Amino acid sequence: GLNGTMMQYYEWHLENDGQHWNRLHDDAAALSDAGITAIWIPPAYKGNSQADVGYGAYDLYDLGEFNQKGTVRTKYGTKAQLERAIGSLKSNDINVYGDVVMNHKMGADFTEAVQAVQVNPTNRWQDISGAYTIDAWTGFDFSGRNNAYSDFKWRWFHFNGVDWDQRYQENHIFRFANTNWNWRVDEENGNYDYLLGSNIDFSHPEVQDELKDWGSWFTDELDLDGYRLDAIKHIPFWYTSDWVRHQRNEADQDLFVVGEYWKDDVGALEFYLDEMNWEMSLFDVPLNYNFYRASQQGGSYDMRNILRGSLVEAHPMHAVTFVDNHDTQPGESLESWVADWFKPLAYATILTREGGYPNVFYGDYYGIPNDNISAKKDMIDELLDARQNYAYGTQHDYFDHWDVVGWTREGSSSRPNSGLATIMSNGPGGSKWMYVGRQNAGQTWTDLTGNNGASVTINGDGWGEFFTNGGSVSVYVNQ
Ligand code: NA
Ligand code: NA
Ligand code: NA
């Protein structure tokens, strides 16, 4: 039972060469070795076009298998190549979590005439026009799949809103007259049901059942071990709960479930987790924003607050920790990018501490060429070494100075030579006496990261004095 580490295996600006599944296939053994235990794959199904990152969600039953939207393959490759990749993951002891997008659809085959009212963007409760007829992109027939797997077809009456009127060619937020916004949902802009595209109305039983059945079809087709659920703050809470329960029923395998409730507000997250009866984890979005505040502010940031307000502080067993993703990366919709100087500190925080299930971002591991962002594979690999081989046993925390902080793990007898001491500063360097466990007395610990040449000998009471340089992190272990 090595500590688990997941990886998001894509970034926004990946090349559209259709070879990503094959890359994943060939990378599997190396990822296992490095300490990755689970992979979050991008949406595997056909979006608006071939170059869709995956959130188009045109046809959930088309995994790069049918000629629809101007391509057989998705951006990532063919269904056959995806299944080959998954086999390779499975035989290297890596779990596969499928990205799941149920909030909306885009790329409809045809428009339909629809009575709609304009609502106020910042208050979707409030109409700002009378009902009139728009043309909405709501008709989905899936020509090319020809009823493989599912003969279900989507129509306007499965939706409650769009943001584009094709009749008079205008952007507005539209509620379909005589439909309701979903509920319960996040209450920013009054009701935050509507995000983009054609918004799915979960009030209809045909819909509830379709996404449950699609859910189970997908899980069985790819042999998934779990899911990331995107946009779950815009999807009615009762349905996400019903959906998750349904999948666990249908599936023989255990299913890990992580939801993205994108809010810088752990209370909002905790409520969601109340409503879900603690049947999934969430991404730790406030922590994302802690790291980003730190990155942006520089050393004046008080490092005692680095974990404060975070999901992982409060519910480590329900937290998926991360530094950045495809939406936080530069120029993206939720941009909150951790600069290179702070990034090792953030990664050490989520990889070497006992709480949270950490996620490594492909873009950090392999680089983001589009933006001249370097691959940080070596830095991350050392932290993975720390996590997999050394971050065990009782933990001691030292958030006791505004620049310099750290923590230790005493190791466990199950894992020989395990134990570690992390120290970092976001300002001038320094040192700190920290306890690593009386049982490690007399050992000599060195920095996995290479940022510090100090040798740290553990005293007879089990204390060492650990050193960090300025704007840096070190992780000392018994090598
Ligand atoms: Na929605
Ligand atoms: Na970030
Ligand atoms: Na500071």
Ion ligand 2 residue ranges (Cβ < 5 Å): 288, 292, 324, 328, 336, 338
CA of 346 to the centre of ligand 2 (A): 9
φ, ψ dihedrals at 359, nearest 5°: -125, 125
| Rounded Cα gap, residues 110 and 89, in angstroms | 39
Residues 304, 294: contact at Cβ < 8 Å? no
CA of 402 from ligand 3 middle (Å) equals 5
Catalytic residue from among 62, 99, 135, 260: 260
Angle at 82 between CA 77 and CA 85, to 5 degrees: 120
Residue written as token pair 């990749």: 85
Q: Binding-site residues for Ca(2+), please?
A: 103, 193, 201, 234, 299, 403
Say which CATH number the domain at 416 has: 2.60.40.1180
In a domain, 165, yes or no: yes
Number of CB atoms found within 10 A of residue 330's CB: 15
Ligand nearest to the Cα of 399, by number: 3
Q: How buried is 293 (Cβ within 10 angstroms: 0-12 exposed, 13-18 middle, 19+ buried)? A: middle
DSSP 3-state of 389: helix
- What is d(CA 439, CA 450) in angstroms, rounded to the nearest whole number? 25
Strands 319-321 and 463-468: unpaired
Pairing of strands 170-176, 159-165: antiparallel
326 lies in the same domain as 465:
no
* Distance, CA of 295 to CA of 1 (rounded, Å): 34
Annotated binding site: 103, 193, 201, 234, 299, 403
CA 289 to ligand 1 centroid distance, Å: 24
Q: 343, 367, 389: which is the final residue of a domain?
A: 389
CB burial of residue 87 (10 Å; 0-12, 13-18, 19+): middle
Distance CA 231, CA 262 (A): 7
**Residue 402 belongs to some domain of the structure:** yes
Give yes or no: residues 284 and 353 share one domain. yes
Q: Do the domain assignments include residue 426?
A: yes
Shared domain for 182 and 220, answered yes or no, is no
Strand spans (E) along 230-308:
256-259, 281-283
Q: What is the CATH number of the domain that holds 197?
A: 2.40.30.140
- The rounded Å distance from CA 73 to ligand 3 centre is 49
Give the angle subtended at the CA of 322 by the CAs of 318 and 324, to the nearest 5°: 145
Q: Which ligand is nearest the CA of 296, by number?
A: 2
Contact 111, 137 (CB under 8 A): yes
Assess whether 223 and 332 both reside in one domain. yes
Q: Which domain holds residue 402?
A: 395-477
Residue 461 within a domain: yes
Q: Are residues 405 and 335 in the same domain?
A: no
Report d(CA 364, CA 366) in Å as an integer.
Answer: 6
Do residues 367 and 251 both lie within one domain? yes
* Active-site choice (230, 324, 382, 410): 230
Domain co-membership, 281 together with 383: yes
Half-sphere exposure of residue 106: CA atoms within 13 angstroms, side-chain side: 18
- Please check whether residue 261 is in contact with residue 283, taking contact to mean a CB–CB distance below 8 angstroms: yes
Which residues are CB-neighbours of 285 under 8 A, at least 6 positions away? 260, 261, 262, 263, 264, 269, 311
Burial of 205 per CB tally in 10 Å (0-12, 13-18, 19+): exposed
Report how far residue 397's alpha carbon sits from residue 399's, in angstroms, rounded to the nearest whole number.
6
CA distances (Å), 68 to each of 17, 58, 98, 141, 331, in order? 17, 9, 21, 10, 29
Rounded CA gap, 423 and 404, in Å?
7
Alpha-carbon distance 276 to 235, whole Å? 13
Q: Is 250 a catalytic residue?
A: no
- Whether residues 84 and 225 fall in one domain: yes
* Contacts by 396-402, CB closer than 8 A, 24 or more apart: 396/434, 396/435, 396/436, 398/432, 398/434, 399/303, 399/304, 399/306, 399/307, 400/304, 400/432, 401/303, 401/304, 401/430, 401/432, 402/302, 402/303, 402/304, 402/427
Q: Which of 338, 361, 389 is the last residue of a domain?
A: 389
Q: Report residue 166: phi and psi, to 5°.
A: -75, -15
Q: Is the CB of residue 222 less than 8 Å from the CB of residue 214?
A: no
In a domain, 1, yes or no: no
Which of 389, 412, 439 is the last residue in one of the domains? 389
Looking up tokens 């999934």 gives 280
Which H or E run contains 434?
A: strand 430-435
Assigned token pair, 416: 């020989």
Q: Is residue 77 part of a domain?
A: yes
Residue 226 lies in a domain: yes
DSSP notation for 339-356 = -TTTHHHHHHHHHSSSSS
Residue tagged 């940080």 (tokens): 376
| One domain for residues 216 and 320 | yes
Distance 325 CA to ligand 2 centre (A): 7
Which residue carries 């509920």 as its tokens? Answer: 183
CA atoms within 13 A on the CB side of 393: 24
**Ramachandran category for residue 194: left, alpha or beta (phi over 0 → left; psi -120 to 50 → alpha):** beta
Pair 281, 258: CB distance under 8 Å: yes
Asked whether the beta carbons of 418 and 392 are under 8 A apart, the reply is yes
* Count of helices and strands (H, E) across the chain: 10, 23
CA angle 425, 430, 431 (to 5 degrees): 105
The Cα–Cα gap between 256 and 151 comes to 29
Of residues 294, 325, 318, 324, the one with CA closest to residue 307: 294
Nearest partner of 227 among 240, 238, 236, judged by Cα: 240
Q: Which of 379, 405, 406, 409 is nearest to 391 (CA)?
A: 409
11 domain-assigned? yes
In the reported structure, the alpha carbon of residue 195 is separated from the centroid of ligand 1 by a whole-number distance in angstroms of 6
Same domain, 365 and 236: yes
Residues 6+ apart with CB under 8 A from 19: 77
Per-residue tokens: 330: 């530069």
Q: Is 112 a catalytic residue?
A: no
Closest ligand (CA of 292):
2
Distance CA 290, CA 369 (A): 26
Say how many domains are in the chain: 3
Query: Are residue 358 and residue 238 in the same domain, yes or no?
Result: yes
- What is the distance in A from the centroid of ligand 2 to the CA of 269? 18
Q: Which amino acid is at 151?
A: D
**Are the C-beta atoms of residues 212 and 182 closer than 8 Å to each other?**
no
Displacement of CA 13 from its chain's centroid (Å)? 17
Compute the CA torsion angle 430, 435, 436, 437 (nearest 10 deg). Answer: 170
Largest CA distance in the chain: 80
CB 445 within 8 A of CB 456: yes
What is the number of the ligand closest to the CA of 402? 3
Provide φ and ψ at 199, rounded to 5°: -85, 125
Domain containing 81 — which CATH number?
3.20.20.80
- Hey, is 134 helix, strand or coil? strand
The rounded distance, in Å, linking the Cα atoms of 329 and 338 is: 9
The amino acid sitting at 52 is D
What is the distance between the alpha carbons of residues 172 and 166, in angstroms, rounded to a whole number?
11
Residues in the chain: 479
Residue 158 one-letter amino acid: H
Torsion of CA 303, 308, 309, 315, to 10 degrees: 130
- What are phi and psi for residue 111, nearest 5 degrees? -85, 160
Task: Residue 459: count other Cβ atoms within 10 Å of its Cβ.
Answer: 16
Query: Which strands, in side-by-side order, build the sheet including 420-425?
Result: 395-398, 404-409, 420-425, 472-477, 444-447, 455-457
Same domain, 369 and 336: yes
In angstroms, this model's resolution equals 2.0
Instruction: Collect all residues with Cβ–Cβ distance below 8 Å to 296 and sequence separation of at least 6.
Output: 339
Bridge partners, 228 (sequence order): 99, 258
